[PDB]
Design a binder for this molecule. Structure first.
Ligand SMILES: Nc1nc2c(ncn2[C@@H]2O[C@H](COP(=O)(O)OP(=O)(O)OP(O)(O)=S)[C@@H](O)[C@H]2O)c(=O)[nH]1
Ligand SMILES: [Mg+2]
Length: 155
């Protein structure tokens, strides 16, 4: 009686992958710190999210990917290319359900601008969502949007 969606959260160390997950799961922001399950209704469908917060089973059986960089970490952003190439290789396709997420939007020290991010997502043909795990801005949006991307690609 529920649809399972297998989601994988990728990106460089320190960008907020766990923080984003833990917000989704626990509704709490963790300052300092596997697989998680969340039941949630999305467009009137009851979904069981199965979320791997990384750092290979999930890499090959993942249905959709959150590719996360932090907006005050230029290197994280530049590393998106590597994660996305990884995903394309291990799924052997050039259109895998993916959302580009730019986290830590609450922070003032911003070195990747929103134009950079929009241009990257536009090149890849994917949504870009700005988030803060600290304030919860964008968090449900990113996960819900990924679900909707997965639905878009297949039954
Ligand atoms: N201000 C702020 N800090 C954040 C936010 N998301 C995470 N952080 C902080 O950034 C640090 C890294 O977050 P964390 O979730 O541990 O990273 P990660 O991407 O999971 O890192 P990894 O080592 O396991 S591969 C932590 O100190 C966390 O509190 C956010 O949106 N805003
Ligand atoms: Mg982590």
């Amino acid at each position: 009686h529920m649809t399972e969606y297998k989601l994988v959260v990728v990106g460089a160390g320190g960008v907020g992958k766990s923080a984003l997950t833990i917000q989704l799961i626990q509704n709490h922001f963790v300052d300092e710190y596997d697989s998680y399950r969340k039941q949630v209704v999305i467009d009137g469908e009851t979904c069981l999210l199965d979320i791997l917060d990384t750092a290979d089973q999930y890499m090959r059986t993942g249905e959709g990917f959150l590719c996360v960089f932090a907006i005050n970490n230029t290197k994280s952003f530049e590393d998106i290319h590597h994660y996305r190439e990884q995903i394309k290789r291990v799924k052997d396709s050039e259109d895998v359900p993916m959302v580009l997420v730019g986290n830590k939007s609450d922070l003032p020290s911003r070195t990747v601008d929103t134009k950079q991010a929009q241009d990257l997502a536009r090149s890849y043909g994917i949504p870009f969502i700005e988030t803060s795990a600290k304030t919860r801005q964008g968090v449900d949006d990113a996960f819900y949007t990924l679900v909707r991307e997965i639905r878009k690609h297949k039954e």
